[model samples]
Target: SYTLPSLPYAYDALEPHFDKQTMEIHHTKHHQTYVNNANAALESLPEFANLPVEELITKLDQLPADKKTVLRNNAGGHANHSLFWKGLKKGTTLQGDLKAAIERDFGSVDNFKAEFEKAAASRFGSGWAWLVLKGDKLAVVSTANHDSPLMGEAISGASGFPIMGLDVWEHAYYLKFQNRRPDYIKEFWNVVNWDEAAARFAAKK
Candidate 1:
């Protein structure tokens, strides 16, 4: 069964940038729905059910063609959101190679934020904006709808991992940003869990 990632901060802790009600609904309802659906899909396939979460995403193409669609859709949803939840926290800061790399690659911290927001806003429909390490450096990439970095071939047709991501789905921020998707994209900087992201970077390489 899928497990919800425990939010590092309270629903109200992200106040002003993201209201409590929006956070609750997004996390408890939207994200949890994906978790439940993912679990149900996994249970329906008993033989593959014992593999670890990481293995499931990495070897999605190996599943039976008939069930591949459901697993890819829902398992990708589950893995993506689970990573999204862990990717966020309160009062996180940037440091180490990632910090220096950001300055060298994007000019400054503010510039990195600007680029990420631009990627998020440019997504024509439901999708995500990602901060990914391509080779040894970072690059901005966007994936449509429930598609994500881990689900290779879905995005870029090349396989690699995502260190951080932001959901641009209307349901994620419509309650607050409304039609102004850029506003929500900008606010994401205030809540990005840089500490967790740095750890992810270290683990990946």
Candidate 2:
């Protein structure tokens, strides 16, 4: 069974940008739900018990129909939240390979931020904004609910390796930002762990 990974930093580490209560509930409640459900669904199919969360999401189509949806929602939630947690830290900057990649793909770091914020803010409802690698290229994409970029062609007709993601679900910030999704999104820059993002990009590129 999958267990929740401890947050790398203290819940209050993000401070004014991300409140401690929000982080506490988001991790202990929301993310834990995903981990619990995902483990239950995966255990139902013993043959797949050994698969990593990412690999399981990529091949969700192969599961029995009933099991497929359960795994897709929960496992996708698990995978997405996992990345989302690591994607944010107190603060960091884009540098080296990831910096160059973003510049190449989106023209400049500022342009990439504009595009990424657009993707996050423009999402009509609960969803996620992602920075993913498609082959050697980078792109920003969004997925609804618990859906993740890892689902690839199996679900969204798009697939790539996710390096960073932002949760836009109300539960992520409703307590702090309320109806002002843009405010929350704009503040996301303050906590992004670009070093981790760069490492992910380099590993997959």
All models, RMSD in angstroms: 1.9, 1.3
Cα lDDT tens digits for candidate 2, 47-158: 8878888788888889998898888888888888888888888758778888988999999999999999999998888888888899789999988888887787658655
lDDT of each: 0.78, 0.86
Q: What pairs collide in candidate 2?
A: none
**Which candidate leads in lDDT?**
2
Per-residue C-alpha lDDT of model 1 across residues 15-126, encoded as one tens digit per residue: 7887788889888988788777778777777777877666687777788787777777667777777777777766878989778878987999889888988888998888
Give me the displacement of residue 40 in model 1, in angstroms. 1.8
Compared with the true structure, model 2 gives a TM-score of 0.95
Best by TM-score: 2
TM-scores of the candidates in the order shown: 0.90, 0.95
